[model samples]
Target: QFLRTDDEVVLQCSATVLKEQLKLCLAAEGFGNRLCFLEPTSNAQNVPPDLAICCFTLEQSLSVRALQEMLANGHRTLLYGHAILLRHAHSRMYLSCLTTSRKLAFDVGLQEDATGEACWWTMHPASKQRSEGEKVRVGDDLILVSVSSERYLHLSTLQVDASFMQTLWNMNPICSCCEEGYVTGGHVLRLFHGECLTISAADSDDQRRLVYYEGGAVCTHARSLWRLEPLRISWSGSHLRWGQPLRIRHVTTGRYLALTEDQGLVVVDACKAHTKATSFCFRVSKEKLKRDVEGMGPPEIKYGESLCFVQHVASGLWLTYAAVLKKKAILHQEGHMDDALFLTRCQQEESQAARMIHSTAGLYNQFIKGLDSFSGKPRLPIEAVILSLQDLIGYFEPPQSKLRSLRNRQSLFQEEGMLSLVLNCIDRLNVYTTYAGEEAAESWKEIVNLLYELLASLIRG
Candidate 1:
């Protein structure tokens, strides 16, 4: 009864068959002995119902003969199976076939182990096979091939016994992309050859990595690995391919790409728990998978080809690039329309501009903390303060010229005489630095350096 494909059969088993199969067949193997029991339905005369209903927990590894005979010309079905599986948040899917020798999901679309079971799994007999294996069916320990000169799938099973599976659980996950570049810091999304992306979230309870000061977060272990199924969204059916639009979350940190009020800033939110306002959309970079050719002489094959990146629907931005700090990565609602919503669109406009202006109001006091390194006198000079304060003024300059772009607001720039105050602060800081330690002077000087670029960009139009 363990043969056939693209079809199924239901059998009203003799009580003996049900009993034997439960112990050795898909019924028990697909789920487990731990599944809660279901009482039988017999008549008042103790007559058995013509057939019982069962479902396949998953389509993998189930025998067609067993499937057809179980309900052959009868009323029972293989219940309890996953036609397609959704991974548990903390778990991963793995394929184990020693003939292939390498670990599953850990290398080949294999995820760390989520549950312990027989290393091998099975599919229906109609499941196709490569010319190598005799059986043109699906089962553990078989090599899978495909169409399109560019695509194919290959996997084999380990013929391990039941006792060996009981002691199992999941292993760590494997990376989808091989990468390189920076050695450390935030938003460390893509890893290079020497890069080993490890998790450092010490507090399991901490749903995601956070930026305490900004009150924001990156993605998480479960959601960041592109561990989601594809979806269909077209109305009339002839929809799209490669399944659905893959979400663009950090492969290392599972967070959804999202937008903020800033026109250029981009940020990630904790997975599964974000508001509509914080959510953003993305799509695949290309239609067909790039099928990065790995495993040469062996002819490597699998379903999913090169993964999807974040393609913003509105901005047409491919959400790549990151701002890393420490061993973490962060995207801000900064400048690019792709990075964030444009200020032109933000209802919180004046709120953001006002807020930043007010917050910086008093950070000047903190400047003394470093400048206090003064030793009274050195090459002190307020004289070194200005080579181009006019440029600074012009940056905050009115777009007063004709055929202008960026909007002008002398009233806004004139606030509390901020331009004068900031300029004066620079002059004083320069004098203070002259009396300051090299380290102290350098530190304050760096702060002075920051204002230049920030002010300059405002006049981009």
Candidate 2:
């Protein structure tokens, strides 16, 4: 007889002489069937009967049928094990099926150690579904299944907030004081202010002098000081207006070297003023003044009168209007004629030589072109151009036998001085090369030397 109820289902197998034959009969009817042989209580020798047993509770029967149906419908079943130990004095074990949709289907079992009884807690299949806006539990272990047989463990229930992750990715350090400039000789100076500073070397034998300018006066921190020679100051007081241009030349040497916006050239002499006194003053020759005044012509003089003077340092007096005599409107109305005549005699040699050189060098277009090219590319490497022009000059204008003889006859002092000047020009070009990049630097070197040679030849004449 078979009966099915919600609580339990019962299957009673018939007692038969052959247990094997009855076992097959119960199995064919889809019962939880087993074979049972019991010894008779009264007689031990003989078995009472060979019997076939079939047993199932209602839930178990339904579970068995459900699994069969799933297999028939081409669904696969996979078993997974899980354990959770509660703080309370109990434990749980579960057997779960992981589905293709990544959902969990679990069967829970509970046990108590005191009672020693095991019970199937629930028979229904439970599944996990996708959650929406749910809070995650802390320290939840999630099993991540791979495409292959490999498995991974993760804390899938915990995650960092998206906004916090973005903040971390965007983090960077801010610079407060970054600037552009060049560092030279281990001293850092700003490019705009034209700040130049020099650092001392580590060796102790070198004399270290730290000099700086403050409030228009030069100050130095040095162990010893020496006075420089007194430089002669020639003042053109009439045209000395603010921001007007001035030119100055070193007198004894005839070096027309420096120009300034107002104050003119600076010269250092180690003889007269003090051992190390450096003079900052402007000087112009009497001839230069005459040329400038005459070049202005008639209309310019009607606008303003030009006055020039050479200040005598020893007399503490200005020799006024020494080149072109001009009547002073005020107290010193009568001008001295003797000082003017002295200036004209003193400037005669320089004026004549300058006129001759200007005439000779002026008409030479090749010389003027070479000078223009040299000035155009002021910053270039010297050696590369020197080699190139050496070839050109040797091929075109080789030194003549008479020129060689004249060169040998020339004074060594004069020749060395001229050579030094040319070398100094080359050295200046090399220094400028550091400022400009390589290409511009290479072009300047050859052109500068050619101009130097042309001027040297004119100076010899």
Candidate 3:
């Protein structure tokens, strides 16, 4: 039993430092919103003995109730921690950055020998009072700031590596003796405590593993990357918080997507009916769409929106599709994520644009040959050449087999350069009808009649 002695911690946060830190809101990154570090007070007093916060303001504050009852029950001995408890406002859970440990000095650190020099496990009796705060929520963000007594670090991605990242954006809090933070199940949070942290590289070209000690710690494992999305309704309201299920369809084949259960994460054409293997779930995350992308130069992030993996529910694997891998999708959790899905709208734009490229190939050929076939003037009757060119430039009913439907802003649709030149040549022919008489001018009626037919089809009678 904890056997509440003189120095054993009770579940309260009435101390000056804890209360001050809890009262303030942390704005590491002003990207989306601030994470409020809240202490709820009760009737004529503090409410619950916990801290709450929320990054997504709409999501509720996560609760960080001290492990008062748990410590009081099991393992009579526990590591020392003053605490900086963090709770997820959306999921309502405490965060931890747990990892393996290193060898320690025997003569230096304190052991639980009891009644010795004040080291981590041993503490003088009669510490300050700690209690729960008002009910609240918590969210997420990233920053790397360090003053005489403060430092909120980051991935330093905008600038520079492990040491660089640590020197820039970093916190890897794991051990309890590391600081005054509370420790529960390898998770610790202390007002003035130290915690170790570890994060693998997000992608290749990353040289070493990222590890830190002595006070660089955030409550969770600091996987600080996400993109904001528009709010919309689904058939159900997103209650499956861990992951929202989705059906990803292959762009070319129109087949629904899946991450197969074979060797590694392979992509395949699953059956046309519903099945468990076909379903995909996701915990949305984001960074630059083409970050560190090579050859193509700074990648085109498409529509200025963020992209994330189509994660699997049970395995925590991410579904990715990229240009490098021959146009197929795969599922995996390597150092960093690449080639993830592009939401839906962007995919539609590319799909429709590709269709236009194929459909207009014939017209492109006709205009190229006939536009200059007769040099400055039609060496042959301009009628057949102009008529065929005009026919290709249909005006109405852009869908299906019509030449008119290919008009769009995409560069792929802009290849119809022949249409303009043909019209230019035809306008010169109009001069012959009135200014002079010529053999070629007589054939203009069939071409004009064809154009009239094309225009008539564009509208009702």
Candidate 4:
């Protein structure tokens, strides 16, 4: 029920309908572009709006001009059982359906205009007891009735294109922005240089990749894959609000991005986790913000679009660009802001592969330990393992049976030993079932199905 107008939201098919929760989120390629459900790890600035207004009222207006400009871009909280216009965050277009072409079974897409009734939908709680005008929570099932067509929007499965169906829909509130804004734990990200170059870990062939040292500046072959791990929870929720400090882990090597105190001169290094040293906070780049407010600066962060200043929380030094060494730009801590970092969510071949391998590693760690705990406790419910595996399989399974994004890495899987563990775990389940009998057999069938699917999907990967 945290839904709000102008806030980015993930529109998902209801989990109850799907039976299994899907990992892929909804996405659009560009303006008027066909929806290809997918990725954006989803803002910041330092300005006290109230104080800025007071200063302006006191006749000090120059600096407050930027703040006032941002206030012009307004947002509203959304309520249930209300007629609202659904807008695509990227295209800034309203969600509309053509009443003539598709007739009662209208085709849903986005349009530039919001004046027509085709653009409006009355949102109501799927649960009958919930009252009207109540805030919509994240993960609440909803029904959207088209104002003009009087049809429900639906996507039956990945096999079928979106059309009007019973269409049980649910939503997740995004931080803020046009593209995705709030950065959350477990989100994969790539931080770009203000100049448009990508910042990545040293190449696999480079010794710096493993030596715990700083590498080159060419930005030519660095593996820019990173997975965010939140060290502290946001006051609001899992979304990393602006100014919140967090940890960044290189997905490939599983190293923490840290600031070293080799001297007053600092260097960004990939090293073992040092909670305090590795913690960095992101906020709006003031210089860039000032220029934008002549346009419009956001109160929250947006992916790729927002240019931010990364600060070392402990040392209070800004991440600065120093001279390039061995063709690699060396990032340093400086007294003032000189370089601005851009956050971009990546979902291409290399990033997807890296994410797959990283997740496999995590799966091994989690499942192995969990299996141990179950073995130690003979009376433990087998359903725990079954449910856990089902959720884990969704992580790497091809969405809606389309193998479009997965990259097969047999050797990498061999190195990860995921296949071996899957079979071994399956064997253990069978052995355990021998003792537990009937009830265990019922549960093992479900686990066996999940294991086979997990193996086949990872093998496809």
- Give lDDT tens digits, candidate 1, residues 69-96: 4333521222212111112111112322
TM-score, model 4 to reference: 0.40
lDDT of each: 0.27, 0.22, 0.28, 0.50
Error of 2 at 283 (Å): 15
Tens digits of per-residue lDDT, candidate 4, 1-461, equal 36556554555553332365543334442221323333212101111010100000001111123433533564555667666666554334566665433234556665556665666667778887566777776667888777677777666444212355676765554333332465554456767663333333332354323222233432212245566654421211245546667666665545555665563322234323456667777867533221111101233666767777776677666665444432243344443454677776754444545544554454545555655666656553454456445644654556543454334344334444567767766776665633344555666677777878877766764
- Lowest lDDT 10-mer window, candidate 3? 229-238
lDDT of 3: 0.28
Best by lDDT: 4
User: Which lDDT tens digits does candidate 3 get at residues 271-368?
Assistant: 43133454555344632220221111222222223343456544556654332111223456642444333321222233333322222333433434
> In model 4, where do residues sit more than 4 Å from their true spots?
1-80, 83-188, 192-279, 282-309, 317-343, 348-367, 373-381, 387-404, 408-424, 427-442, 445-453
Model 1 stretches astray by more than 4 angstroms: 1-200, 203-207, 210-226, 232-244, 248-257, 260-309, 314-317, 322-461
Task: Give the TM-score of each candidate.
Answer: 0.23, 0.18, 0.23, 0.40
Poorly placed runs, candidate 2 (over 4 Å): 1-309, 312-316, 319-416, 421-461
Kindly give the stretch of ten consecutive residues in candidate 1 with the minimal lDDT sum: 23-32
Candidates 1 and 4 compared by TM-score, better number: 4
